[PDB]
Each structure stands twice: as C-alpha cells, then as structure tokens.
Amino acid sequence: HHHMLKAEIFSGVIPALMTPCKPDRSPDFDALVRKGQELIGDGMSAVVYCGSMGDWPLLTDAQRMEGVERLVKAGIPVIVGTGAVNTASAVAHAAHAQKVGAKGLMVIPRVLSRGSAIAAQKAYFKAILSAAPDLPAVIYNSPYYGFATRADLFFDLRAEHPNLVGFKEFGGPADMRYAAENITSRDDGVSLMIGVDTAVFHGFVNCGATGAITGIGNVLPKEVIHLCNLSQAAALGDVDARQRAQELEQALAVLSSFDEGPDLVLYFKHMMVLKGDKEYTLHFNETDALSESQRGYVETQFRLFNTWYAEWSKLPGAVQRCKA
Amino acid sequence: HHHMLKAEIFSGVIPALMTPCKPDRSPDFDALVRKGQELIGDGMSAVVYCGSMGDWPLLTDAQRMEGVERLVKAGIPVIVGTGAVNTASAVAHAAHAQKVGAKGLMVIPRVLSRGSAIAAQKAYFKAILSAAPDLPAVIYNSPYYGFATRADLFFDLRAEHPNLVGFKEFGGPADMRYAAENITSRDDGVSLMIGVDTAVFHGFVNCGATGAITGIGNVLPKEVIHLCNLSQAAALGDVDARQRAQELEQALAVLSSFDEGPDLVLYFKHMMVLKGDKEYTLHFNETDALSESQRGYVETQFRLFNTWYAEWSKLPGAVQRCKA
Amino acid sequence: HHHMLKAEIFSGVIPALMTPCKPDRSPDFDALVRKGQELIGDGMSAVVYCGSMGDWPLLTDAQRMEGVERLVKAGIPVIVGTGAVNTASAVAHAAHAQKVGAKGLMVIPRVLSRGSAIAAQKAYFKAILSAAPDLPAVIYNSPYYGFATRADLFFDLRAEHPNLVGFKEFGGPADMRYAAENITSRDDGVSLMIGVDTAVFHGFVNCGATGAITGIGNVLPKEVIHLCNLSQAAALGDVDARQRAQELEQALAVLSSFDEGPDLVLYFKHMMVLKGDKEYTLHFNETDALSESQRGYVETQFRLFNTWYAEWSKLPGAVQRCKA
Amino acid sequence: HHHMLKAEIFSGVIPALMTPCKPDRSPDFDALVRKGQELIGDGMSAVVYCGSMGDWPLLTDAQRMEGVERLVKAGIPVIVGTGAVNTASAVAHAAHAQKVGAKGLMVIPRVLSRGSAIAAQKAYFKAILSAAPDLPAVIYNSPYYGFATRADLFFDLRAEHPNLVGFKEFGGPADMRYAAENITSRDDGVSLMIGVDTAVFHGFVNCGATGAITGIGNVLPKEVIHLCNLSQAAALGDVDARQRAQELEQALAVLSSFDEGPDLVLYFKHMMVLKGDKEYTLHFNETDALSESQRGYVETQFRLFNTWYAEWSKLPGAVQRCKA
Amino acid sequence: HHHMLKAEIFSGVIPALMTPCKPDRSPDFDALVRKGQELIGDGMSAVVYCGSMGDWPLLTDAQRMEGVERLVKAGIPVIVGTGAVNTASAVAHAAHAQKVGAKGLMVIPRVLSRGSAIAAQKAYFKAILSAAPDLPAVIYNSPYYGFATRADLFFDLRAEHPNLVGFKEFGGPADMRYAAENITSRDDGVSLMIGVDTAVFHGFVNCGATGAITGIGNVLPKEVIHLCNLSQAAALGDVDARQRAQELEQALAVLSSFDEGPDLVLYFKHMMVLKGDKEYTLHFNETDALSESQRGYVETQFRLFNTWYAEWSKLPGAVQRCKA
Amino acid sequence: HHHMLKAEIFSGVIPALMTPCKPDRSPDFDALVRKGQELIGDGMSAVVYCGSMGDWPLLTDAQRMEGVERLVKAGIPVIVGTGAVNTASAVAHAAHAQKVGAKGLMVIPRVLSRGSAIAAQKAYFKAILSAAPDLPAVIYNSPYYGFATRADLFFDLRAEHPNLVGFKEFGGPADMRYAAENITSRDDGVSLMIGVDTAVFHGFVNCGATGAITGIGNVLPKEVIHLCNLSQAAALGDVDARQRAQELEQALAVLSSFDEGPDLVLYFKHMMVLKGDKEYTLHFNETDALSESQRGYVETQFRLFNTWYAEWSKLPGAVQRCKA
Prior knowledge:
The structure is a homohexamer. By secondary structure, chain A is α/β, with parallel strands linked by helices. Chain A is built from 13 helices and 8 strands. In chain A, strands 1-8-7-6-5-4-3-2 form an 8-stranded parallel sheet. In chain A, helix 1 crosses helix 2 and helix 11 (264-274) packs across helix 12 (292-312). The PDB classes it as lyase. Keywords: ssgcid, Structural Genomics, Seattle Structural Genomics Center for Infectious Disease, lyase.
C-alpha cells in the first residue's frame, strides 16, 4: 500500500474553453489560443479542450485536434476532452493528445449507442485510457449518461490503467460526497475534481477536491480563482475564509447555475461579449441564440454580480489574502 | 421592439387581505377597509382582494364585489382577485373591477372543471383579460392547478391582450427562475411578482421581481417592508443589504412558511388576534380552527420572531437605511 | 357485532347524469328527466345528480336542486351529489336531498379551502352527513383532493353517522383493494361502489363491489349493464362470465378511459350526439369543445367498439345469460 | 378545412435495417441490399435506413448515404434516418435523401448540444424538414431526448412545413394515446406510426396507427406482419382477430422487449445469426457483444417463441386470414 | 467454460412452511412435520424452513433449528432459511443446516445493522456460504433490504463459493428479467427461483425459472402445482398450457397477492384454518390478528377461487395433462 | 385541559452510547461505564443505551440489560433503548428498565414482522409502554420503518399510556415541523427530541425541541453541547447566538452527516480511536471496517473541523457565553 502525490495537472483552476467563431462560423483558432494564454496569465493552471463548453459536437474531430495542437504549441497545459459519437473517435482524440504532448485526458462516457450499458462503458473507458497511457486521466461522471461509475468500476479500471488518477462529478453534492468517501480519499494519488460551477465550496471544503474545471471562469477568471483560493484556505481550517468563500459562492450562484443547463454556451458566450470580447458573438449554428428575455436576465445578473463584487472585494482579511 | 415602464400597480409590497368576520360570521367590511387603510399607511403600495387569504370560496360573488367597492371608494389601490368556480363568475369579477375603478387584476386559473386542460386555461384567461381591458393584469401560476403557464402561452395571451403585464409564481425557486429567464426579463414592461411569502429574497435579487404579494405582511407589515426594501437594495448591488436581507428572511421563515399550506388563513388570522386585532377571531366556517398544538406552535414562533427582531432591527447600516 | 343488508340504493348500475343544455345554454331539465327515465328503463337502478358528469361547478345551487327535484318527482331513484365550493353549499345540497325524498347521498370532499387538511375533511363530512341523517350515504375518495379517507376516519364517521354506508374510489386498483380489505368487507352493511368507468371488473370480482356509478353508461347503457352483469356472475364463481367480462371490459377500455380525464363531459356529450341525442351538443361554457383531433379519435373509437360489440354480443353462453 | 389521404410511405410494416459488417468491420452494403430486398419480398412495405438499428453513430455520414443510395437504386422504398451529432449532418442526410429519391424522412431530434431546449428542437426540425421539402416526413418522439413534441409544436411545424405528415412515438402507451387524441386523428392526412416493437396492438387498435417501424421484424418478418395484419383486422372491428392479435403480441413480447433497451442491436444481430444469417455475427465495435447469460436467454426465448408459433399459426379463422 | 446440471433441490414447487402454534403459543413441531409430509405427498418437491412464512423473527434460533432437524429426520428435503438479526446467528443456521443434512440453503441479506452497505452484504453472504460449503445455496434479492445483488457481486461470490447456484427474486417482473438476462441463463448450473407467489408464470415462461418457493401453496398445494405444471409446459412451447396457465394465475392472483404484504402470515394462517387446519388458529404474538374486514375479504376471495377452480379444473386438454 | 412540566429526562444533550469491544469482541462494560461517566462529566444530561449506536442487533438481550444495569448502578441517568426483533424482547427491555430504575424509555417500532402495518405498530407500542408505566417514554419515528406515527396515533397512545411524553424524529426537517406543529407544542408536557445529528438548530429554534440525542456528541461532547447551548439561546431570541449556532452547525455538518447512514458506528468508533480511545478499535463483527477511502475522508474532515473550532471557539459574545 502506497502514498503518492496527486497529479499536478488536475490541481488549481482550469477553464473549459469556448471555441470562438470566425465570421464564417468556422473555429477561430488564433482567438482560442489568445484566450487560453490570457486565462493562464490571470492565474488559471491549465485548460480543457474540446469539452461541452467548446461545442465539441458541432466541430469535426480534425478541428478539435487542431485546436488542441495550437494550445499545446503555445505552451498551455492542456487536458484533452475525449467526448465522441463513437469509440474510434474517442480513441483518436486520446491518441492525438498523447502524440502532441498534452498534459491530461478527460475521459467522457459513451453516448448514443449502448449509453446505459455498464459493460459498454467499462470497455469504452479502457479503450480510451489505453490510447494515452502516459497522460494522467480524469473520468467524468454525470446522471446525463444513464449510468454511474462507482468505486468498484473505478478501482477495477485503475488496476489495469495506472493513468486513471482522477474523478470529476457533475451530478450533485450527494454524488460528490459519495466520490470523496469511497473513491478519492485514499492515500494513493487520486484527485476529485469539481465538475460543475456551482459546487466549488462543497468540493474543496467538504469533499477534498484538488482542482475545479470551470465554465464561468472563462468570463470571470479573477473572481473564480478568488473563490477557489478562499475555499482552499477554508479547507485548511481558516475561519474567515470559510465565511467569505460562502458569500462569494452565493453571489456567483446565478451566473454559475448557467453551467448546469442546456444553454451554457449561449449564456457564457454572451457574457464574454458583454465584457468586450466580440469574437464570442456568433455560434456555430446560425439559429442558436439566447431569447430576448434570456439576454435581459443574464445582463441584469452580470451587472448585479459585478457591482456587488466591486465593493465586497475590498474587504480586509481573507478577502485580500486569497485574491488571484 | 419596444422598451416600456413596468406597471406601477405591481410594484412594492402588497398584502392579500383577510376578510374579518362580524360576530354573525358575515364579512365585516368596515374592518376590512380599516385594515386596508392601515396597511397602506404602514407603507404598503396596494392590496389584493378577494384572494385565497380573503377566504374567496367561502364568500358570495356579491360579497367579494362589495368588499372591492368599499376598498376602492376608500382610496386604496386594489388588485382584484378573479378566483372562481366558473368562467362566468371569474369574468364577472373582472368586469366589476374595471367598472368600479380598481387598479389591477389578478387572473387565477380555472378549477374544478377541466382544470388540467391547457386549451381550457387559455380560453379562460382570454375571457378574464377581455373583461377588464383597461386594468393591468397579473397571471397566477401554481402546481396546484395541474398545469403551468409557460412562455409560449404567456406571450400568445399578451399578443391578444395587452393588459397582461405580470406573472406571479407560487411553485418554488426553480419555477420563479424559469419565469425570470424566459418571461419577465424582456424590455417590454412585464413584471415578475413574488407570490409566496418565503420567496422574497430569491424573487427580488435572483429573479428581478418588481413587487411582492404578501400574506404574513398583513400581520407584520413593517418587518415585511423592511425585508423587501433590504432585498431591493441588494438587487442594486449593495453588500450589507444582501447579508441583512437574508438574515431577516431566515428569521421570518417559519412564520412565512404558513403561507405555503392549507391552514394559511387559520394561522394568519390567529397571528392578527395575537397582536390585538380581535375582529380576526372567528372564521366563516364555525369549525375551522387551529388545534391546540398548532396554536402553541405559532404563538411560540411569533414570540421568537418578535424578540429577535426587536434587537436585530437596531443594527447600524443597511438595517437602518432600509426600514419602512 | 351485527350483520346487516347493504343499502339497495348503492347496488346495480347507476349513471352520473349529464345536464343537457337548452340552446341558450341554461339547463334543459325536461331533457334531463327524459334521459333519466330512459336509462332506468334500459336497466339502470338509480342515477347520480348533480356530479362532475352533470357540470356541477357550472351550475347554480338552485339549478342543481331543481334538477334533483324534477328527477325525484318523476319517480327516479336519485343519489344526490354534494360537490360544493363551501360547507354551507354542500350542507344545503344534502338538506335539500332529504327534504325532497332523494334515496341516497354522494358525499364529496372539501375543495379550494383547506383541501388537504384531514381535520377539515372530517368536520366537513360530519356536517354533510348530519344534514341528511335519513339518506344512505357514500363517501367519494380520490387522490385529486390531496387526501385519502382511510379506515380509521371512515369508521369514526360511521360511529357518529349511521347513514354512512358506502365508499366510492376513483384512485386506482390498489386503492380499491385497500378499501375492500380494510373498509368494505365487514359484516355490517357497508358497500364498495365502483367510481371510475375502467374499474368495473376489478371492483366486482376482486373487491366485492355492490354497484357501479358510470359515465360511459349514459351513452352505452345496455353494454355497461352487460359488463356489470357478467362481472357479477364472475363474482359468483362462473368460469365463462369471468372470461367474457374481461373481453368486454377490454373492448370498452378506450371509451371508458375518458372518464379518467379532464375532458370527460366533452367526450361523453359528443358520444351522446353521435348516437342521435342532439340536446347534448352545447356546453355551458361557449368555448368548451373537443378539438378536431379529439373528435376524430372518439368517433373512430366509438365506431370500433360498436362494430366489435355487434358481433361479440351474439356469442352463446354467459354473453347471452348476462344481457340487460 | 380539408380531408387528405395519409402518406403511403408510412403505411404497413417497415423494418429499421441493421447494417451488417464485412469481416474487416466496415459495412457490407451488398448484404444490406440483399436483406432489404428479402424483407420487401416477405411482405414489408418499406425500410428505414440508417436508424439506431443500423448503428448510425458508429458509421460515417458518407457510409450511411452510400447505404441509402444502394437501397434506393435497388428499388426499395426507403425512409431515411436523420439522426446526427449536429444540425449540419442532419440536414445533409435529409438533402441527400431528397437528391437520390428516397420516399420518406425520419426526423430525429437534436442531441448532445442543447438537447432539452425546445427552441433548439423547433429550429432543428425546421432545418431538417426544409432540406427535403418533397419527402413525406415523420418526427420521432422519445423521453430519451429530454423533451416532448406536443400538438402545439407539431402543428406549428406542419403549418410551415407541409411535408410533416407523421408522428412516431417511443415513450409508452400513454404517450401514444396522447398523440392519437391530440395530433394524429384529424381529417388531414397525418399518420401515427408505431415506434417500438412492443406497442403494435395498442398502436393499431387503440391509437389508429397506419404503420409500424419494426426491429424484431428484421428477424421474424412473417410473424411481425402476421401480428400487424391481425391488429389491423381488429381495428376494423373483427372479434377473432382482436383475440388472436393479443395472443401473438404476448408470445412475441420478450423478443420484442429487446427493442426497448441499449443492447437492441446486440440482441437482434444475434437472432439474425441464430436463423442462419452469419453476416450479422460481428459488430462495428470489436468489444460489443452479448454476455454468456444474455446469449443463453435470447436463445432460450427465440426457441420458445418459434415452437409456440409453429403450432399456434395453424389455427383456423383470423390466424389464417391474416398471414402475410 | 462448462455446462452443468441445475441443482435438483431448487427445482419444482417448494412451500415456505408456516410454524403452527400450540395453545401456549410455542411451536407445534409435530404439526409442522405433519404438514411438511402432507405437502410433499401432494406433489411438493421440498420445503423452506424457517423463512418469513415461518415467523422467524418471533422464534429463537434453537426453535428454528429444532424445526429444521425434525423436518430432516422425517425425510423431507429441507432448504434452510438463514434470516437473522446478525452474522453470528445467520452463520449458525447455515452451519446447523450442513450438520444435520438439510439439502439446501436460502441465503438472506443482512438487516438492522449496515443493511444498505454493499460491502457489508458481500462479507455477510460469504460468511453464510462458507458455513455450509456442501449445501446448494440460493441468494434472496428484494428491494426491502435497500440494496440489490447484481451480476458482478453474484459472480464474484460464486467464484469463491461454488455452492452459490441460485437466485431468488422478490422485487417485480423487471427485476426477475434482469436476473434471467444477466445472471441465471448461463450454461453453468445456476437456477432462477420464483420468490413471490404472483410471479409464477412470468418466472417459468419469461425468465426460465427452475422452481418456485410458494406461500399460497401451503394452502392450495394441488392448485399451485397445477399452475406450475401448466407454466412449465408453456415454457416447452405448448399453446394450450400457455393460455390455461395465465387463466389460473389470474384466478389465483388475489390470494397470491397476500404474499406481497406485511400480513402474509395472518392471511395464510387464516386460510389454513378455513380449510380445516385448526392448529393454524393462533399466532406467536397474542395481538396479531386480521381485522374483521380483512377476514371477510379473504373468506370471500377464498370461496370465489374455490368455486371457479372446481369447474375450470374439469376442462379438457392442458388443464387435465398438467394436474399434480 | 392542563399545563404540565416537560420530563427532565428528555431535556439537554444525550449521547446514544457506543458499546466498546474487549479484544475478544465481547462488550467491555467497564469501558462503557467509564465513557458514560465521562460524558455526563463533560455536560451531558443523560445517555441512551442500547440504541443503534450501541450495536443492539449484534448483542444479546442479556448483554444489553447488563450494560443498562451497570450504567444505572454508576449513577448515570439512562434512557433505555427497546429496539428488538420481536415484541417479547422489546417488552423485556422495557420491564427490565423499570425494574432496575432507569429514568426513561426510548420506544422503537416493530421490525422484520409486520413492519409496515399500523395496527401492528399500535399494539406493539402499547405493549412496550405498558411494561414500564413509571418511566417517561419517547417514541422514535423514522421513514426506515415503512410507517409514520402521526398525531392521531400519538394522542390515542398517550390517552391510554400517560408515560408517553416524547417524540423523536429521524425523517427530515419537514417531518420535524409536522411534529412541532401537530404533536409537541401543546401545553401538556410533551417534548420533541432531536433524533439525528444534523437537525440540532432546526429542532431547537424552529421546532421547540427540549433535548437532543446525539451520535457525534460521543466524540465531540463539548462542541455538541456548545451547539446545543447556542441553539437554545437562539430559541430565546438572541441575535448573536442565532448566527453563531448556524456557523457551528455548518462546520459540524460533515461529521454529523455520518449519523444519517449505515456506517454510523464504523465512522464514530473510528473517530473515538482518532481522539485516543483505543477501546473503540474493534467491532463486534470481525469484517466490519471502514474502507481505506472512508478512513481517509473521516480523518481529513475530523482534522478540518478541529482546526476550525480551535480558532472559532475563541470568538467573543455568544460563542463564549454558551460554552459547556
């Protein structure tokens, strides 16, 4: 029985990048790289590409791999998303990640064909893990797939695939607790990663999370790093940070809750536009757009949060200590 | 595409009035008018009559209309409740509201006959709206009716009935969020109204509500206005009010939660009696009364809240700024 | 401990009558009486008036009582529906039933005010039962009311109100079984009544029901009596009837299932029109009507059932023995 | 208001074809065409390609279109499946269907990106319908997508897209009834199609279905046509067929129920192998295979059904009249 | 990979015996043995003692073991129930079963302490299986325990404990199908046992069951054997038996459904009394008794079933062929 | 109608004691008494023995009674747990409690035999209460039993059994509110007891609880007394305590939540070991142990809470006023 360091690539704050559109609605890879570099410069530790935030279903496999290569060539630590329509595609993403020197793998379950069958999932995960043996890997778990990776399966996979060192949960606080209690609190180098924007405090403080993959953090990087830092200080036992982390998470809650729904890319791209990044204006599908009411709601809530934060962020104590 | 002012009648804090009984268990209209005048004097903006709080099912249509006329003649801004056993009655309430110069209409869904049929509801709402074309109207939405008014129906009604300018939700925070995101955050003068006592902070801060119809506010008007003011200041981005509004809402939560259940009129009338308004002693039905345990519970919780509030309400800062 | 005969008024097949409209959309009482007389002549044992099938919420209390008096004066055994917006109305229906010599009382729970409170229901049932002490009474039980009358309450009511001798269940086969096991299979003269059109076989054979209140039986009286007779012969142990009752119930199932939904009066009145009773054309509300697709569906299913029945009803054995 | 003939392409019995593998696990188009021709020769009216039964997610868009072209060139009436990872792909399938002269379009909802958003679905369906204006189209509806096409949306689409003439339901008997009552029983040429193998009798007799898309029918074409014929004769009012259709559906129920689950292609391809079609041995994914217990179960149930059918199919009357 | 015969002890029809009371409410072991011998003489293959039907929680461990020894000494094949308050007791039952020469073991999950923990269940099952290595063993699976034994656990246990050769399901038709598909249809000698009285046809015909443990069969042995024989003939492909088995199961359904509920021993002991076995009059607890209504219901349903059966059982064909 | 003092034995903070093991895995009664004395010395008011925390199912009745006698002889106020496999055992525990001079009775519902039958529960509770007429008694209520004691049953029992003076709820905040509103807020000396570790603030402040039975309090007595004192001061109306009680409850929430699950004794005994009480190392079952991940999780959360508390507990105001 062994004690091992957790994988550095799954620590800290990690945006799942959006893919900006050129005016012709093809990917603007230059703008992708610029945003990635900017977010690392703001204090992010790595990025995830191409995930749901990156519009993976709307892009070809070649386009995703080009985006991955461009990010890696720029010196950005990349965790590669393996979401796919089939095993061959998922494997290809993983093989390409290892080939080009990405630093991590996000292993996404099988969809559309045998989605609920646990035997199918086991084989699919093994195929993906086998294709990038040298890359630390995190498995995504969500009720969306009609199945759950439990401890038995996780440890069976890990016994055959030593690169499986992480677990990322979308499915709610109770599911994250299940993971912390039964999977990720061994001695042995396995990390729980926060996998939805609304679960940051719960993940770091109540579940021993090592890192957070963020949607809203693409828009509000300094504020999301601030929350993550406060939450990590709270996990050390700090009194002041534990209060402050909760205040900030609650103020962020509406804008973070867009990460939970179908329109996450619509909402987050519109927020990028609101803060002056016009390249986030168009979507890959010509008719994908927020409604008039949805745009008004997000604009109102964006303004509210920015106003609150402008004053709250001046408070002495943990608020200052934990800034990015 | 237009920007328009929200209807003033659906702004601020608005009690849904109880109908006091005379000793013979007929309505005491004089006492109704006195309470209405008092609550406006305390800082309420309008009243709702005759709603569920007013015991509408227990009163004749003529009695409700008499109460409405008496309130209007006294100079009180009245939003008229159209709850009814049938379309003809609901229409009559609406027509009477317009005739006598009430300022708003609360449009209540069809019950008892075709309650779950959305085609029935659409026609019923159109009949009611058509009967008071000059009065701003709010539609009530609750899971109790076995159906939900969604954005499609709301906007279809509004296209034919320009007086439909409001939406009032009973069904929980998620339903209120649905309404804010998809219905009430357009540019065009439509208001979300808080429609249950426990949802005040969530409505104003997270959902952009313009006003609150209140049950507990009949009993604790100054305290409920205080909460609404704090919540509205929080919606401006204030740090201190956002903390204080939540403290007050939590202290009020038990007494507000009676608004959620079948015995709301029993509980609220007994609270009116506790604060010295003896005309709230009797109910229209001779056997409707709280149990011994229910009376003890409410008395204990009333005393608790009053004790807490007496000291908390002296705190400096937003607490003082936002008093009625 | 006693053995007593079940109340004759709650035996056999009992239509819950529709209220036909005159062209001005007021009740056609003459047509009501003609239909009642016709259905008794077809083999029905009694009628229920004014129930949900009779559009009670759309009619005034005076109109319902006029319909009741007219039926009673014609010599028809009447079970009076006490559905009401309030206790005073429900009591008035019951008092009027006893005054005019109706033969039974259908006791309907409280709605709109304190609907889910069991203390309210107990008091409401006692008020109604007390108002017609001389009339055998059946309590209606349905999940629609947000509460269930269980054995404890039923027997407590019966101890104070000896006229409570029946139980009518809308809520599904399991609820009917609960009633048979725990309420209606004592020695003591209490009857289970089938209370939804789709539960006839289950009620008579599996639950020991004594009678059936029917919606579809207004339209297809001979066929519904045939099913009830077959089911009762099956309850004697007959082999052939037990097979045949199930075949007929299954063939009737679509048309019977309209009794389960909000549009029951729409569907059943349209079926009355299809068989040539034009006085069932209009509804009390001008806009209540089946859609084009709903009319097509019912017409197709009506024709199907009539075609099947025309041949099936010629079969030898229990089919012939059990005809009305 | 108009009466119009239902589209012939959506009548009768229609297998959703499996894509056989060559030994190299690429599609065997020759074997696909041979099976299609054989099934039409057995009595099937049309085929669906490439649906879930055809392993669409595992095949490239070019491969699906090649299969479609090969079937069409062979003279087989083809309904084209538009299942896709994105709008551009779904549109391409539809455009290709129209280009090559397929006879119908199966319109499959959006997945993976905005799957639950009804605004997204509406736009997606319009894009697909617009791409093949000349082809009769059926929309698939299933709870799997996190949304339901109701009558409002269906009729809104149909008003702009006259080729939308069909509705196919996976979601259970109640959902099929909803469709029959509210969508497909107008006068106007719209067809309900049975969309899961276990719902044949319910669709034809209780819901007025015009045709059935079948999985198990690829394996047992004569037996599935027999059931469909019996069910259609039952829908005419036949007594004997109504009994026999139900006996056959019940005997077929286990083998049909595999159509409901994730392993449908595994189970049905293994059944094809059992009846001597070795080209159905391999799957596109090397590790997709039934377990030892699953193979034993299906083999046992296949043998059972064949034994029962061998004798039952000799019975006189409707059994003989309704054979393929 | 191996083919092996299923264990004979888990084939056929097997009553779970009631423990009759002496007048002092201690067990009447003499009467227990007499009933066991009688039921084997009627055609039962084995018995289960002491299960829930045997009132295990009400008896001491020593009493259960005495009953087991007495049955075994009489020459009756006994499957021993290991239900227990703790591991030590469950192990003791198993060890005693092996010591005295019982023929099988019914392995019952852990309760009261760590009931929902799957790690606890695994260890508990291993402890029980290890204590009787020479006895074929069946694991009971029910939602009552807050957990389910799936294929993974079953096969893991079986790999370490070769005596685990059976699976018994209480939890409904879908759970029994899961077991047939994934656990019990391998080549390798594992048996599915019907474990609730209402699932006989479904188990034998749809799920490949080898045997049935019965409650109602203690009361109606010849009739339950008749149903089991008909169901087994139906599983061979017989047409007539498949019809008849379903008719008999449906006629038996009410009396069988008592096996599903908390009062099973109350209902079944009262039925034993009705057929003249007075030693089934008393229960171990002085106040455990059916209510007046429950006794009336069961008496009515017992009489109904006996009357139906008396005539139905004379029918020619499979009815005669399959009698005990 | 009377006002009466609540029973002192059900006031304050009351650990449900663990039973430590000797190395041979028999109970260490000496260590049990030492811990009981220590916890009373820390500020606890009484103890509960032998409850679920005490491993009751794993111990003989004689062992539990020995533990009870030893605690009572030591001068510790004991509330005796009556959890049992049958009525005779439960009665024996109660009779023994009264015989030896325990101060209270915890009345636990019937399990394993007729668990869901309310008639069985009523009789079982009466048997237990009758056996210790002189001891104040609290009934435990939990969804785990498949039934709920409501006000009707509680007051019926209390009318026949004047020693029934308490109610203890496991089932969640809404169930505790139901109890406060309808059972425990009469004038008449009935106490609500907090019955799960996570419900302390809600019980004292929102529900008028008089005492708390605690699991985590065995490990963290001073901290749990601190929370209870703060919560009781909050129930007086204190502003500062109401804030502080909630901060402490939230910091304690993870460690308290182990009380909600199957592994409560595993988690709490391991925490006792962590604070240096080695006699809590072994469990009665040799294989009952936390997993590696569960041990890591609890150790991390224990350390976190202790670190936070070390600093938070120095704060001025209510924090200091309310220390044990």
